[PDB]
Amino acid sequence: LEEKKVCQGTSNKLTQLGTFEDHFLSLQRMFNNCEVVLGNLEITYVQRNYDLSFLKTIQEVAGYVLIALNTVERIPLENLQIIRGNMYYENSYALAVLSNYDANKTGLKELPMRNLQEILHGAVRFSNNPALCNVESIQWRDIVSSDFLSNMSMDFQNHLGSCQKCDPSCPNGSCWGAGEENCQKLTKIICAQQCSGRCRGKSPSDCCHNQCAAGCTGPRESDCLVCRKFRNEATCKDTCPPLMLYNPTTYQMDVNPEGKYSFGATCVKKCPRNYVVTDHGSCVRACGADSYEMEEDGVRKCKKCEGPCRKVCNGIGIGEFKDSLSINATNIKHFKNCTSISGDLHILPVAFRGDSFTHTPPLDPQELDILKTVKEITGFLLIQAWPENRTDLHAFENLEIIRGRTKQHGQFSLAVVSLNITSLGLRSLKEISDGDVIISGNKNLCYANTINWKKLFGTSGQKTKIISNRGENSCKATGQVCHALCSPEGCWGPEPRDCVSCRNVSRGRECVDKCNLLEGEPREFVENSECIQCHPECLPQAMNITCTGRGPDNCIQCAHYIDGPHCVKTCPAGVMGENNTLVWKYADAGHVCHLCHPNCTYGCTGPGLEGCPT
Amino acid sequence: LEEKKVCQGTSNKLTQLGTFEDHFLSLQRMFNNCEVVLGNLEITYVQRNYDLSFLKTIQEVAGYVLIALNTVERIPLENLQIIRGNMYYENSYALAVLSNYDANKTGLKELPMRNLQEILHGAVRFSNNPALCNVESIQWRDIVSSDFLSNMSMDFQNHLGSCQKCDPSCPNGSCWGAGEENCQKLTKIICAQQCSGRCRGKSPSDCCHNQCAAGCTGPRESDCLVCRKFRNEATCKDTCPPLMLYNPTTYQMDVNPEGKYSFGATCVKKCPRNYVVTDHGSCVRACGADSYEMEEDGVRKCKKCEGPCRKVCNGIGIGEFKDSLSINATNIKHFKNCTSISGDLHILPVAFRGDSFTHTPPLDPQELDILKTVKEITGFLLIQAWPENRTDLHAFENLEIIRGRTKQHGQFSLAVVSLNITSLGLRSLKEISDGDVIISGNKNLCYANTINWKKLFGTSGQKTKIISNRGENSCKATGQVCHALCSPEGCWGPEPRDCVSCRNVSRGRECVDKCNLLEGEPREFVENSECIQCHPECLPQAMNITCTGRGPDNCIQCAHYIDGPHCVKTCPAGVMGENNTLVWKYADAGHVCHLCHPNCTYGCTGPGLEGCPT
Amino acid sequence: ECPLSHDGYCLHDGVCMYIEALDKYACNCVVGYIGERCQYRDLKWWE
Amino acid sequence: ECPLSHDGYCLHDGVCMYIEALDKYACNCVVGYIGERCQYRDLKWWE
């Protein structure tokens, strides 16, 4: 596996997922055989005789690393190498060990974290481990970032001393718990005076590259162990090589034969489909308010918006929506005219039930119709509660596409679980670009197995999980099946409004069998199996088709007066026109209109001036 | 102070600008008080006993160096550090010294180029100058680049022994001149193996930043002597600090307070007021393949090509114009319909003559009517020839503006020299922005000393050179004074057709004494000294003004009816609306237009049904 | 236990436990729900 | 003088000399005209 098997990492930090055996199995499958934690590394609440031998593969972490409240023996984190600390525990620390003991003080004995060599951000903390040995003689000035040394909070009293001292073969006997290889291997406070960063020896000829984050095998950028910034499957760069160089000999941007895009932290050749490309060459999730995503054939970047600008709308979890977790009955008014949603949408029963802890009143169950104007979701849609009165998602009937930028769980982009709704109600879903979808745990819900989700999925690799829904025969042998005046597949409910494709004509939206070609007062005409209404001013042809399109010249026999390519109810009778002149017609028996004699302004009725008074 | 005193450098490969005495005046008029040669340096045909003492302050040459064919004895280039050999002499050499000897085997003896450290691009050539001494033992591997070791041919015929031998206190007898100071100080092949290039010594901490080009003081970047790339006014970077930086956590772009525009081998806080800013803030000459221009609040961005974006035309020299030196009669066809010449125009008397050297036939004078559609010249305009029978510049009608991206001799954009023409032939020239004007040498050309160029020059500091052009005395006597009615600031010609702006105001293509405000037949308003007629629907105001704009929205009182903001002749009665529903309105008391009842089909003469009777 | 201040702090029928050592409050999420306040629902393993 | 092959090479009334050392040809521009073959007119100093 050239690419590192990534895992998601928890974000609970103070919770119990069931019972002790339940907390450990959930933690097991969550971290079993993963080599990069893209989140946090809570290892809380393990107990004696369990096995944490599956932590022998964690190599990097992208957030704080909590280890708290677990009475257990060694936690074999013998391969952690860097804690990028992108998010701090308690706003300060990035490796926080707190209270690893019982009411008998037989807690966390040892912690062979030997390979840890840099914590790119945040302080550290090691409080209250009554039986913890040799994690008191380590250099918290070599590992910790040289800025946060004021927030360190080491405090420990191993007043139940039972651990030996280890082989005296490494600096100051700085030992990570036992043995000789189990002791420190530092690479910052033995480097030469003229070393840029870390090193590998003591000579001034062996400083490491300026972009390595924990030691290096060689003196070259292609020899770092962990890239401090963007990587390239190669030399750990500092910023992806731009697309166009400058060539200051001739003042014009000459392109680069090695330009690549910055996808978070990587240099890729091309941005993914669901990601906004930028002129700078950087896959992003959105762009400034002075723009909007103009589709450019799958390379859909965003240009400046001229004059009025499209109403982009920040979803939940971003910006000011941080202390909120669902659509409280205080942040619902902020979705009034949001035709799109930059972010994602959460609906949880706390909104309808009311949160005293957050001090938000319950939500008006009918206020959800404000979300009707929503047309595109950038992230995911998570629904876990809808009022029992309504029988369908009566607020997302206009939703068109779910991009899938910031997807839930690193997973499913549409989640409708634990509902009581008979018909789904998403009549306008056309594509879900990237993600997955689960609709399950709905007793009285059907029509969800008829749709062909395989078409709605943009990229390849997505998959659905639809179980626990109302059974096949409980729907089949009760009448509530797919409509007969609809496609053999792709239907969202009984009513004619919503069943995707049609086998016959359709009044714009509704699949019907036969529209008004021969009878009916508003007549229509079929084009590409979508018949559209036409003028009433044409004559109703009781024999054949009564119009040949939409415009006025498409009346088989226009019952009113015909002026060349135009027939109207009454031919113009003094309409102001172009070139600053007046168009004046008249009426006769043969029912044709021609220009009047320009003598009388009042308009003629016949030849010359005899009809109109002069 | 942070800038030096630059000079443009010669380009005459091996010519002789006169005799030996008036050639030297061409050397010292341009290389006096230089600090950095922006072009090339060529010392040729300097005779014995001539004083070369201004060559002391030359510290950097942006091209090549040619010291050939002279019989001076001492050339004190005792401050030359780096030869960033952009241009190549003989397409292979960046420093050539040939045939510096007169007939009797004597000539150039010394060359104190002791400070010469690096030659970024190019080679060195020494041949047939049997008087130069002590420069034969100079080890060249230290100065030239790495690869340039097979094309730097050299030979030294110094066998006279007439120069004092080298001082035995120098690194292996490598001395440029005589004395302890004049000795080659190696800084490329003496220092430690683990150095990144330049190195002011041998200690492993002496290695210099890889962005110093001719040695350094310390291992920092702000201590380079001369640098290989951009200059952020204190340091010497590789690429300018971008305006906006990525963010590996939020997938966004963050504004960089250290924002610098890559303005041609130096970072600047802001592009010049006449340059086209690229999307990622980099001053360039003109964006190419498919784009536009955009004068938004001065910042001349260029957005994109869409649809029929016409072709842009490259000036002389650049592109496929390297061979020819003017618009000769073999390339004027490529200017068939160029409407904005992104470059420069050269009119040389070789055009109308035709040379047997480049085999270009003589140009037909009437061919110059092709340029009658050249609406824009971004660079400079050198007018140096014009057929005698023509009375003025007929081709370039208005030009409207010359920007001045590049210039002639680095100072001049407009050049009118030695023309027998009688008139200018440039009747708008509204916004000349960069450069000076040389309008002189025309023996018969009046009405030139009336145009107030301060009203035209955008940049502050430009000046005029209107001298010796049919002196203004008696121009009035011979009748050549321009039209005696238009407000005197302009008049490139003797007709009222072409004057700065106009007598007072103008009615399209004609000047007038005053707009038709208050009275007149057509009501008018004033903006930019132009008279535009009010909308026919504004009422003739015999008291005050009539309107404040073209549209019926700016009327003080409508003549007939008033449909909301607009002044209409007759309230709408058949205008297309929403949902294909027609529109019928009526005039009430104050002639205000209100809509009909949704029912009234043939219209209504009153509100609701009580208005449209049977 | 948790006092008369964190009532309803634990969503989805979650009991509120008290950590006296850290002086911090934490839920005991019933099986199935995750998150700091048991607000989410574990989809990757069940419905 | 250069042979009957580079006639008309030197614009603006300049002579065509044969450099006997380098084996090259080059102009001798009269006062005022600068350039490889005397094309331009020195604008910074005269008219």
Side-chain angles (χ1 to χ4, degrees):
Chain A
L1 275 298
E2 208 186 359
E3 51 276 359
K4 305 293 178 70
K5 328 176 65 61
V6 307
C7 48
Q8 184 68 217
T10 82
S11 297
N12 300 319
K13 101 178 66 179
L14 244 214
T15 355
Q16 232 254 253
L17 312 185
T19 63
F20 279 143
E21 282 180 352
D22 291 330
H23 200 105
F24 165 66
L25 62 86
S26 88
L27 180 88
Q28 186 169 209
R29 56 196 171 189
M30 178 58 217
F31 287 124
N32 196 331
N33 200 330
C34 86
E35 302 166 358
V36 164
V37 170
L38 298 171
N40 313 123
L41 191 64
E42 278 93 0
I43 305 171
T44 78
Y45 288 100
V46 183
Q47 292 210 321
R48 301 283 266 177
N49 278 18
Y50 292 150
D51 207 340
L52 307 103
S53 81
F54 59 85
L55 294 159
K56 264 185 174 183
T57 45
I58 306 287
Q59 290 199 27
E60 309 167 36
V61 175
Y64 60 99
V65 173
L66 196 74
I67 298 176
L69 297 173
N70 53 339
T71 176
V72 76
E73 213 161 2
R74 62 194 293 248
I75 299 182
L77 269 165
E78 72 177 7
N79 282 121
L80 199 68
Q81 283 175 19
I82 176 174
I83 300 179
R84 303 179 189 264
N86 294 336
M87 183 168 43
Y88 308 145
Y89 178 80
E90 278 295 318
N91 315 307
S92 310
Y93 321 100
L95 171 55
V97 161
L98 300 88
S99 298
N100 297 331
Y101 64 112
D102 53 337
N104 318 81
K105 284 86 73 178
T106 70
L108 175 59
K109 177 80 160 297
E110 60 163 4
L111 182 45
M113 209 178 291
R114 39 155 179 270
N115 265 273
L116 178 69
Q117 280 171 319
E118 182 145 353
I119 301 177
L120 292 193
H121 290 74
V124 187
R125 168 169 157 80
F126 266 83
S127 280
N128 201 8
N129 312 128
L132 174 62
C133 56
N134 309 346
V135 189
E136 52 183 350
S137 76
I138 315 299
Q139 323 277 337
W140 292 125
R141 71 179 185 87
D142 186 294
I143 289 178
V144 184
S145 187
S146 298
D147 203 324
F148 311 84
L149 269 295
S150 87
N151 296 160
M152 303 298 290
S153 200
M154 319 295 106
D155 44 346
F156 29 71
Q157 287 85 359
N158 191 343
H159 70 271
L160 303 86
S162 315
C163 279
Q164 72 278 3
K165 299 173 287 297
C166 83
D167 189 326
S169 45
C170 55
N172 309 107
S174 277
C175 193
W176 272 107
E180 54 90 22
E181 83 273 10
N182 192 259
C183 88
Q184 200 164 355
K185 40 180 81 171
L186 51 91
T187 51
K188 191 158 195 165
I189 54 185
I190 60 161
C191 308
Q193 208 285 322
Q194 53 89 37
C195 278
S196 45
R198 319 190 86 79
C199 53
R200 43 193 301 272
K202 280 169 153 293
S203 44
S205 72
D206 296 316
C207 315
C208 284
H209 213 79
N210 48 9
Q211 288 294 281
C212 314
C216 67
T217 298
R220 180 193 52 258
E221 198 157 79
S222 161
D223 285 337
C224 297
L225 271 176
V226 165
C227 312
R228 184 173 255 270
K229 263 150 163 293
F230 311 84
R231 58 191 209 97
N232 290 58
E233 191 181 1
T235 48
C236 307
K237 282 315 192 62
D238 171 50
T239 307
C240 283
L243 295 158
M244 285 154 313
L245 302 183
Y246 187 76
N247 197 331
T249 310
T250 70
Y251 302 3
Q252 260 168 15
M253 282 291 174
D254 187 350
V255 304
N256 192 310
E258 289 162 332
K260 280 170 182 176
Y261 290 80
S262 85
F263 186 26
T266 308
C267 300
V268 284
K269 305 176 296 296
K270 50 185 70 175
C271 280
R273 280 220 303 103
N274 54 352
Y275 271 107
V276 167
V277 194
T278 56
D279 49 47
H280 307 87
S282 48
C283 315
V284 298
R285 288 175 174 167
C287 54
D290 59 337
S291 189
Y292 58 89
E293 183 161 351
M294 313 179 187
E295 209 293 327
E296 209 172 29
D297 191 285
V299 198
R300 45 184 298 160
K301 72 145 189 172
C302 59
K303 308 153 50 183
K304 305 179 191 304
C305 48
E306 52 271 16
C309 195
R310 278 298 91 204
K311 189 48 68 190
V312 73
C313 196
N314 52 2
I316 276 180
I318 307 300
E320 67 277 23
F321 297 147
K322 216 57 174 183
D323 64 343
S324 277
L325 71 163
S326 88
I327 301 182
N328 306 318
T330 181
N331 67 333
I332 181 67
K333 46 200 172 67
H334 292 72
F335 293 81
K336 282 167 180 300
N337 292 317
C338 310
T339 177
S340 168
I341 293 295
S342 55
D344 45 354
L345 261 185
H346 294 133
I347 304 187
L348 308 177
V350 55
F352 306 138
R353 198 172 53 196
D355 194 4
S356 173
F357 181 64
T358 310
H359 320 94
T360 76
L363 179 59
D364 307 337
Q366 71 276 60
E367 205 74 24
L368 293 180
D369 50 7
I370 299 188
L371 297 173
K372 274 210 170 185
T373 64
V374 182
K375 182 77 77 182
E376 168 178 325
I377 285 281
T378 49
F380 65 93
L381 183 57
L382 178 81
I383 299 183
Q384 292 180 57
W386 208 274
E388 203 271 329
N389 284 333
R390 282 306 293 157
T391 191
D392 58 347
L393 303 172
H394 76 284
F396 294 131
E397 79 177 57
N398 310 111
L399 198 148
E400 183 81 15
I401 183 150
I402 296 182
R403 316 290 330 180
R405 304 263 172 75
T406 166
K407 66 182 78 170
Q408 159 73 266
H409 267 54
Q411 269 292 107
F412 324 99
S413 161
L414 182 68
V416 191
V417 294
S418 157
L419 276 301
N420 173 87
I421 43 159
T422 301
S423 68
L424 190 51
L426 307 175
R427 64 193 78 251
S428 45
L429 259 289
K430 304 226 172 273
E431 199 190 44
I432 309 175
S433 59
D434 203 318
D436 298 73
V437 58
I438 59 151
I439 307 172
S440 278
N442 312 297
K443 314 166 297 299
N444 52 4
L445 182 139
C446 208
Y447 308 123
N449 190 90
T450 47
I451 312 175
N452 193 261
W453 297 99
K454 190 174 55 66
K455 303 285 185 68
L456 269 66
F457 290 157
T459 176
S460 192
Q462 316 190 64
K463 43 212 299 185
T464 188
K465 192 175 69 178
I466 290 175
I467 47 155
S468 158
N469 291 112
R470 214 179 181 203
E472 281 281 334
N473 287 19
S474 46
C475 288
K476 188 175 179 181
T478 192
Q480 289 183 359
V481 285
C482 193
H483 206 288
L485 273 298
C486 295
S487 183
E489 58 267 354
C491 42
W492 300 73
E495 61 280 338
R497 274 138 78 171
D498 52 356
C499 55
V500 201
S501 194
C502 308
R503 204 175 135 170
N504 272 330
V505 287
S506 87
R507 293 96 171 100
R509 44 93 181 173
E510 167 190 340
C511 297
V512 195
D513 54 353
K514 169 185 178 177
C515 60
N516 291 341
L517 299 185
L518 309 189
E519 284 316 316
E521 316 82 12
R523 302 277 163 97
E524 302 182 302
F525 194 53
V526 60
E527 48 265 17
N528 313 67
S529 279
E530 301 102 9
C531 69
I532 298 313
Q533 208 260 329
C534 77
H535 287 172
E537 293 86 9
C538 314
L539 192 147
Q541 183 73 258
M543 272 186 166
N544 304 340
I545 52 171
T546 184
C547 51
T548 79
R550 47 185 67 259
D553 52 70
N554 291 74
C555 311
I556 177 168
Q557 190 192 21
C558 187
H560 310 135
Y561 313 93
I562 171 68
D563 285 328
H566 277 275
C567 82
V568 302
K569 173 64 183 70
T570 317
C571 58
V575 182
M576 193 47 233
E578 321 87 350
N579 315 337
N580 294 146
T581 188
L582 259 177
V583 194
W584 278 101
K585 300 252 170 174
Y586 57 103
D588 49 350
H591 298 334
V592 68
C593 303
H594 296 90
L595 190 66
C596 267
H597 207 70
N599 188 358
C600 64
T601 299
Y602 286 157
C604 84
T605 190
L609 54 90
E610 206 289 328
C612 67
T614 38
Chain B
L1 284 171
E2 298 200 290
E3 89 290 336
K4 296 177 180 173
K5 286 207 62 54
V6 309
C7 40
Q8 303 288 327
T10 82
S11 51
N12 348 288
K13 259 90 234 314
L14 216 89
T15 83
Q16 177 183 348
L17 310 181
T19 57
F20 300 149
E21 195 44 272
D22 50 0
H23 190 138
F24 181 84
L25 271 297
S26 52
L27 261 296
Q28 87 176 2
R29 267 185 185 170
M30 183 175 67
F31 290 131
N32 201 270
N33 311 274
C34 281
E35 297 266 328
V36 49
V37 159
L38 277 171
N40 318 132
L41 186 141
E42 283 152 5
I43 317 293
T44 56
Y45 304 111
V46 171
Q47 275 303 279
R48 202 150 270 178
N49 276 266
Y50 271 120
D51 187 351
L52 287 152
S53 158
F54 41 89
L55 301 190
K56 300 299 208 57
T57 68
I58 290 171
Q59 304 177 359
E60 175 188 336
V61 166
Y64 58 98
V65 158
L66 174 85
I67 310 296
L69 269 183
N70 48 7
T71 310
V72 67
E73 183 164 353
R74 170 180 170 83
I75 314 174
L77 280 169
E78 68 184 16
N79 279 71
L80 190 49
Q81 308 205 257
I82 182 175
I83 303 290
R84 42 176 85 240
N86 299 342
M87 284 73 86
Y88 288 176
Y89 182 84
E90 288 283 75
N91 263 308
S92 316
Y93 306 142
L95 200 145
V97 171
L98 289 86
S99 298
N100 306 90
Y101 74 111
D102 69 331
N104 52 4
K105 292 287 196 174
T106 183
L108 187 59
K109 274 258 189 170
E110 301 137 21
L111 196 58
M113 280 206 298
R114 43 153 176 270
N115 280 256
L116 185 61
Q117 297 287 355
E118 186 91 358
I119 297 181
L120 301 188
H121 309 96
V124 192
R125 168 60 174 261
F126 275 68
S127 198
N128 262 267
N129 48 6
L132 178 46
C133 60
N134 284 159
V135 198
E136 64 176 0
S137 65
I138 299 281
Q139 197 166 185
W140 279 102
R141 297 193 293 109
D142 170 275
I143 295 169
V144 290
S145 172
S146 180
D147 41 18
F148 290 126
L149 261 296
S150 88
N151 50 4
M152 48 155 290
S153 88
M154 60 183 182
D155 51 69
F156 292 79
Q157 273 299 78
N158 172 81
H159 85 89
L160 305 93
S162 157
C163 280
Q164 51 270 15
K165 57 180 309 303
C166 196
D167 199 302
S169 45
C170 296
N172 209 323
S174 86
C175 46
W176 281 87
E180 196 277 332
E181 40 180 3
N182 283 321
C183 280
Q184 183 192 29
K185 43 189 74 63
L186 308 99
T187 54
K188 189 194 164 193
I189 60 177
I190 68 160
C191 55
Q193 284 71 11
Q194 55 106 36
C195 272
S196 297
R198 320 308 302 184
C199 41
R200 77 278 189 192
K202 289 183 60 62
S203 157
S205 87
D206 285 330
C207 312
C208 303
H209 199 314
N210 56 328
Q211 293 294 102
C212 314
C216 79
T217 315
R220 220 194 319 170
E221 55 183 351
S222 195
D223 283 322
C224 293
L225 271 174
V226 303
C227 42
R228 207 170 290 98
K229 290 296 172 64
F230 306 156
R231 293 186 45 90
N232 198 23
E233 88 184 2
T235 79
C236 280
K237 311 298 295 178
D238 200 327
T239 66
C240 288
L243 300 184
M244 290 177 188
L245 274 170
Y246 200 43
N247 193 2
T249 81
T250 67
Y251 291 74
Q252 299 289 323
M253 314 291 278
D254 293 355
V255 53
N256 194 341
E258 192 181 351
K260 291 301 172 50
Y261 299 73
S262 157
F263 178 32
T266 184
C267 312
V268 65
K269 203 67 190 60
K270 182 147 138 61
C271 280
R273 212 186 59 81
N274 82 96
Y275 264 100
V276 60
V277 182
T278 318
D279 56 347
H280 43 277
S282 79
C283 321
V284 288
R285 285 264 176 76
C287 57
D290 45 280
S291 192
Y292 281 161
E293 288 224 12
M294 171 73 171
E295 185 76 31
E296 56 179 4
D297 57 274
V299 174
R300 286 217 63 104
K301 298 255 297 182
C302 67
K303 54 184 181 294
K304 203 47 188 182
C305 167
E306 73 294 339
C309 63
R310 80 287 182 275
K311 200 165 58 183
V312 178
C313 213
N314 43 28
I316 298 297
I318 72 184
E320 66 282 359
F321 292 160
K322 46 187 178 304
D323 295 333
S324 291
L325 57 89
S326 83
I327 43 177
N328 52 6
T330 188
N331 61 16
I332 200 177
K333 64 183 182 66
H334 298 256
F335 299 90
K336 184 64 70 177
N337 202 2
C338 314
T339 174
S340 159
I341 309 190
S342 84
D344 48 7
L345 269 181
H346 288 197
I347 311 190
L348 264 291
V350 74
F352 316 132
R353 192 187 74 185
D355 49 348
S356 165
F357 201 46
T358 45
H359 303 87
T360 78
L363 184 81
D364 304 331
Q366 305 313 101
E367 290 286 330
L368 292 185
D369 312 319
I370 288 175
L371 312 180
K372 280 180 173 180
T373 174
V374 172
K375 285 299 201 306
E376 201 43 50
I377 302 168
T378 57
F380 69 91
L381 178 64
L382 169 74
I383 300 184
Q384 209 177 120
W386 209 247
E388 174 178 335
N389 48 7
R390 270 318 291 166
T391 187
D392 60 339
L393 304 162
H394 52 77
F396 305 100
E397 181 76 30
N398 34 69
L399 223 19
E400 231 76 46
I401 182 170
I402 292 175
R403 288 188 175 98
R405 306 290 171 72
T406 187
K407 295 169 283 290
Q408 174 77 337
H409 293 340
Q411 191 189 187
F412 292 112
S413 69
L414 184 50
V416 192
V417 285
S418 47
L419 283 192
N420 53 2
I421 64 182
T422 319
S423 200
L424 271 299
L426 297 170
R427 57 179 39 89
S428 278
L429 205 59
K430 309 286 276 191
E431 218 274 317
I432 173 69
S433 45
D434 189 327
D436 285 321
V437 289
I438 170 64
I439 313 187
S440 279
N442 317 318
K443 46 177 191 292
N444 43 12
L445 195 151
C446 288
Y447 40 85
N449 294 107
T450 59
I451 316 163
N452 184 85
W453 301 81
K454 281 306 175 180
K455 270 288 300 176
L456 307 189
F457 281 159
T459 317
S460 183
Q462 311 161 85
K463 62 204 188 42
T464 78
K465 203 165 180 179
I466 324 297
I467 64 162
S468 68
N469 266 340
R470 214 202 167 274
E472 202 267 355
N473 215 348
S474 316
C475 285
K476 322 175 308 298
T478 177
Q480 289 301 126
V481 58
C482 60
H483 196 264
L485 173 104
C486 67
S487 43
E489 214 167 5
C491 71
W492 283 263
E495 313 163 342
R497 164 193 188 174
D498 36 18
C499 294
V500 45
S501 173
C502 257
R503 208 267 88 78
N504 267 135
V505 276
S506 60
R507 304 276 177 76
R509 66 184 184 274
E510 170 188 339
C511 293
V512 281
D513 57 354
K514 65 178 184 63
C515 259
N516 282 327
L517 295 161
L518 312 177
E519 70 291 332
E521 179 73 4
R523 323 279 101 76
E524 298 172 350
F525 73 94
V526 187
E527 283 194 1
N528 296 3
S529 302
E530 285 187 346
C531 294
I532 305 82
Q533 293 174 359
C534 291
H535 193 78
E537 272 310 298
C538 315
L539 192 120
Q541 302 291 349
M543 303 283 82
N544 303 0
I545 62 180
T546 300
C547 65
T548 66
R550 304 178 177 86
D553 312 344
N554 304 152
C555 306
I556 302 184
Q557 189 176 14
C558 320
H560 289 91
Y561 314 100
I562 167 184
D563 181 2
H566 304 264
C567 288
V568 190
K569 187 174 184 179
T570 54
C571 300
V575 177
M576 179 68 62
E578 179 66 17
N579 194 29
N580 195 14
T581 297
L582 294 72
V583 170
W584 305 83
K585 292 181 181 176
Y586 67 92
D588 200 351
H591 286 274
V592 185
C593 302
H594 322 269
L595 238 139
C596 264
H597 196 262
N599 277 27
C600 296
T601 301
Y602 316 117
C604 61
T605 61
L609 296 174
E610 52 186 354
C612 74
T614 305
Chain C
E1 77 165 354
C2 295
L4 240 117
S5 277
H6 289 224
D7 304 65
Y9 162 90
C10 208
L11 312 178
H12 287 225
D13 210 292
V15 53
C16 191
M17 75 207 292
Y18 186 24
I19 319 297
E20 99 279 15
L22 298 85
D23 194 56
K24 280 188 172 50
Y25 287 99
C27 279
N28 177 18
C29 292
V30 291
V31 53
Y33 299 130
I34 71 182
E36 184 153 354
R37 290 182 56 181
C38 311
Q39 71 268 15
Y40 278 175
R41 165 61 176 258
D42 171 87
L43 314 181
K44 206 158 185 172
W45 301 112
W46 213 241
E47 28 256 66
Chain D
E1 52 175 36
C2 58
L4 278 54
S5 50
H6 282 81
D7 282 358
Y9 171 38
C10 207
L11 323 177
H12 273 253
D13 190 295
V15 83
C16 171
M17 57 180 54
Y18 166 42
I19 301 307
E20 285 183 351
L22 293 82
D23 198 7
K24 294 181 186 298
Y25 302 145
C27 274
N28 170 12
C29 306
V30 299
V31 287
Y33 304 137
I34 63 189
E36 159 65 30
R37 44 199 302 185
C38 318
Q39 56 249 20
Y40 305 114
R41 173 81 173 94
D42 187 13
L43 307 171
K44 334 183 73 171
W45 294 128
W46 289 89
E47 61 252 41

